[PDB]
A paper describes a structure:
UDP-glucose 6-dehydrogenase (UGDH; EC 1.1.1.22) is the sole human enzyme that converts UDP-α-D-glucose (UDP-glucose) to UDP-α-D-glucuronic acid (UDP-glucuronic acid), an intermediate sugar in carbohydrate metabolism. Molecular cloning of hUGDH revealed it to be a 494-amino acid protein that shares 98% identity to bovine UGDH. hUGDH is a hexamer of 57-kDa subunits that assembles into a trimer of dimers. UGDH is a member of a small group of NAD+-dependent four-electron-transfer dehydrogenases. UGDH catalyzes two NAD+-dependent oxidations of UDP-glucose, the first reversible, to yield UDP-glucuronic acid in an overall irreversible process.
Author numbering:
A (entry chain F): 1 to 382, 389 to 466
B (entry chain E): 1 to 381, 390 to 466
C (entry chain B): 326 to 382, 389 to 466
Write the structure that this text describes.
């Protein structure tokens, strides 16, 4: 009855950090070491202020770091001394070659695999842990099969993480379900059981689903695409609301009361973001094209096309509402993160709205509570960032002297802003573009204040 | 407080009929009369055997027919007498004009509004209650605006119906929500409250949604589109599973367990049928095209296209497995209804699979416990040469090359497959389009069957 | 194939000549170059300078190397791509080539020259793929 005592995780990211921190917290007698090549990131995980923002993570991490949980960058000894090894690195979409701008680049998963083999002896369980697993588990096993040592016995499992950034701790503390994939051998089922026992410390038996490696990845690929589809479906409906004169918040409620559909993920928005959804759908389309399933690839493609359209339509409305020029006009961008309560910008619609407006000559003022200043400048370029982009220290700075305020991220605090103060210093007429619906019910207040408030899924 | 006391309902179909029979049942003190042009149909609504099969429906109707609920062809008098007039007539898709085979025809709706006006005096609330409402309430209000009598005071309302056929009685007795669309006038809100108060007899107040006319019709369209998309998405995954050795049922479980997705409506199938989904999606597309939203049109069009693909892929697998020749080969089709526990065959998947096989010259033998023989011969119209309606499943499999399962009748598991296989031609194939035979796989294989099912391949 | 060493054995359009004009080796090389591979080309007769010319419009500087013998082209390589039927390629020491390759070690026989060598190469440990025949 193999029991896991030492866990090494390769990847100190939004997935790896939080996951292992909870595993450490819930399991005191099992030592968990998180390793990364990025010294900066590891130093931060060891300091008072962490490298990522996640509600509740500070308490989790500080309650068992140095008792039971470690951060090292010494990848070699952690691997050597471990029973289970997570691979939680990133898989960027390729920038050249076939599958450019679509297919996932497995160059880090492979390099990891290769290093494990170099530093491993005896038995070890290697589990692939990611948001979007694209032929991950197979790649690893392919490396291990071909690079065997004497008395080395490596098992490959799949274990896709379902956490959502912003609510990671809650999700990791109480997940809808846990998904472990491993070979339908007896070698095999034993490694699955041994990981199953890890989770059985805080997740009950019948919430842990055990299937085969591939099924597990296909399950994650599909699940991510279904959720992405809901957001796009309601976003499509939001477009229809605007041309006909209904409310998408109202239409969404009517929909959501059907228990077969359910009421979650029906908030219309400027466009879904994050390192998952788009990457997931593009890789699902690519997979399908490779298996000669054009019809299926054509079907899921629409989830991307619709998201693009949502972003582009919202943008045109801004320029449209400002007499078809924003040249030399000051515009405030409130919220830069892809979603609330996180520092992460990857694939954020704020990045897209900002760029589209800069191309029309707007002087932007960006504010976000938790996105670092340096990140914003990177995202927004590839010098024009010098001329047009300023980074504000508070919302009211971004708004002073501004022709319009664009809300891109549903930060709670945005509802709580002093709007009498903001209107007073804006140039008139002052516009608010709510790309998140966060200012519903506030309509009347804001109009009477003198605003021309334009929001998605509702047209004047 | 305007109190409704007499209800008339033009259209006694799979919607008009049950809905009214339940309204009547829930409210003893209010008279419900259901009218229809079709004489044959109205006589069946009064007879021991109803014109539609729907579980629970018989005990419900025969608890208040001739007492609170009446069924009559005398339309002109039910209207004259009623405070509330439901419009539950079918809207076939236009066979000609701009938007042939896409848009819905509003000629029956328009001839109702004309009939209403003639036989109407005083205040009356007119309510459009259908499953795919397309600009419906706006066509009615428009006829009312044009033809104005002295002291006529008609109020138009939208009350779409969320019942699923085969579980209609449950869905009506205990709905998820009721949706009432009225004009944002005070005239208006008085009209909405009266109807709201009819439902308050059995429906809790926080399950009744009040909105304007259009916001109600758009929500219905969306609502049916969202469900159809669910089936098509899991169907697409089924194709991908067959190409890669996974199981769509196992995948649907893992997907379903996410509380933000929901576990309902993720059963992969030969494809969705019903008088709703296909009509509903195509209409949404047509609207979007009309409003200059080609982006939105193309998106929802993928729900229909995936469904066409799933059906066609299923048809090809059958043909393929029989060496690409099915001339004079007996095939059993089990299940002609679009779903289980109904006799409705509108847009049924079994129609399309059947016709594909028929194009290959196959001799078809069809069985359904509830679908009228005549309905099958109409739906497939060659008929004389290839199609036979079987009176029991075993006479459909006697000497057949393949058994094809299209409807999820509970009677289809539990068949004596020992007996079926003995009299079948080998190789004996079973094509399970509904996953009804799950679990039984090993039994069927040792019996000697080659069992093929959607979302899983050898 | 970013940063992956791959040996290109043969660059001539066919055996017993140094002519490279419209050789498949130029295309296979360019396709693998677009993947960011580090190519090490060997040919017994094709001049070194002619190769770099055929592989040009800087991408060459970063990605191409010309090998003086086959064994340096394969030393630490991920795959051996045979593109020209030089008789010498059948005669190579594939025991030696393997011990210094990165695994999985691949041989892509574009010319069918390693026929009848398949069992020796498999037991040695190569995953040998050829045209006109698949696993
Ligand atoms: C993409 O992104 C998701 C991963 O999520 P995430 O937010 O954690 O990504 P992330 O970028 O936040 O985390 C990835 C981390 O892994 C580390 N890493 C990458 N390659 C490495 C290697 N070669 N050796 C050691 N460390 C390495 C990086 O330093 C990085 O900090 C995947 O699920 C996929 O969809
Ligand atoms: C169709 O299907 C959906 C609901 O299903 P359903 O059960 O109503 O369809 P159904 O066919 O069961 O009901 C249609 C009914 O409409 C009635 N009808 C049609 N034209 C009429 C007219 N000229 N005068 C009086 N009655 C007339 C008939 O009674 C018929 O039974 C609707 O949304 C619509 O799109
Ligand atoms: O109703 C909604 C919900 C979300 N979004 C947007 O979509 C994006 C994604 O949000 P979310 O899904 O919560 O963040 P993720 O961290 O990407 O998490 C999702 O994707 C993860 C992998 O990234 C899965 O593991 C999780 O289960 C799933 O919740 C955000 O930009 C949101 O604004 C909407 O527009 N409307
Ligand atoms: O997981 C599933 C569920 C259903 N179906 C099929 O989809 C079609 C339609 O199913 P169903 O929705 O149950 O029948 P409907 O009578 O069309 O009912 C739906 O459509 C109505 C409008 O027609 C709405 O009012 C209802 O709320 C909605 O449940 C049928 O052929 C089913 O077999 C599947 O293939 N897979």
């Amino acid at each position: 009855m193999f029991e896991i005592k030492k866990i090494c995780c390769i990847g100190a990211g939004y997935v790896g950090g939080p996951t292992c921190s909870v595993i450490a917290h819930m399991c005191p007698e099992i030592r968990v070491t998180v390793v990364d090549v990025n010294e900066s990131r590891i130093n931060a995980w060891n300091s008072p202020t962490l490298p990522i923002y996640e509600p509740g993570l500070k308490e989790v991490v500080e309650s068992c770091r140095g008792k039971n949980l470690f951060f090292s960058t010494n990848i070699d000894d952690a691997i050597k001394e471990a029973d289970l090894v997570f691979i939680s690195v990133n898989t960027p979409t390729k920038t050249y070659g076939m599958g450019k701008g679509r297919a996932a680049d497995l160059k880090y998963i492979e390099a990891c695999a290769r290093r494990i083999v170099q530093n491993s002896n005896g038995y070890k369980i290697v589990t692939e842990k990611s948001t979007v697993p694209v032929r991950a588990a197979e790649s690893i096993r392919r490396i291990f099969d071909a690079n065997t040592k004497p008395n080395l016995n490596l098992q490959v499992l799949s274990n896709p993480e379902f956490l959502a950034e912003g609510t990671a701790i809650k999700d990791l503390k109480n997940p809808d379900r846990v998904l472990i994939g491993g070979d339908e051998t007896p070698e095999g089922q034993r490694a699955v059981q041994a990981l199953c026992a890890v989770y059985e410390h805080w997740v009950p038996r019948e919430k842990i689903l055990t299937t085969n490696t591939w099924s597990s990845e296909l399950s994650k690929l599909a699940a991510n695409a279904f959720l992405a589809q809901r957001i796009s479906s309601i976003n499509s409906i939001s477009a229809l609301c605007e041309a006909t004169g209904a409310d998408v918040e109202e239409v969404a409620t009517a929909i959501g009361m059907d228990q077969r559909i359910g009421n979650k993920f029906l908030k219309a928005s400027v466009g879904f973001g994050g390192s998952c959804f788009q990457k997931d759908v593009l890789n699902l389309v690519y997979l399908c094209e490779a298996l000669n399933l054009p019809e299926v690839a054509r079907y899921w493609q629409q989830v991307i096309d619709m998201n693009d359209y949502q972003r582009r339509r919202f943008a045109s409305r801004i320029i449209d509402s400002l007499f078809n020029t924003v040249t030399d006009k000051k515009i405030a961008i409130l919220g830069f993160a892809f979603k609330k309560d996180t520092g992460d910008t990857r694939e954020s619609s704020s990045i897209y709205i900002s760029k589209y407006l800069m191309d029309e000559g707007a002087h932007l003022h960006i504010y976000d509570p938790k996105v670092p200043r340096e990140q914003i400048v990177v995202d927004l370029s590839h010098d024009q960032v010098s001329r047009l982009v300023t980074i504000s220290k508070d919302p009211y700075e971004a708004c002073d002297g501004a022709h319009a305020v664009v809300i891109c991220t549903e930060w709670d605090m945005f509802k709580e802003l002093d709007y009498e103060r903001i209107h007073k210093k804006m140039l008139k007429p002052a516009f608010i573009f709510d790309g998140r619906r966060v200012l519903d019910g506030l309509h009347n207040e804001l109009q009477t204040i003198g605003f021309q408030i334009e929001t998605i899924g509702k047209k004047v």
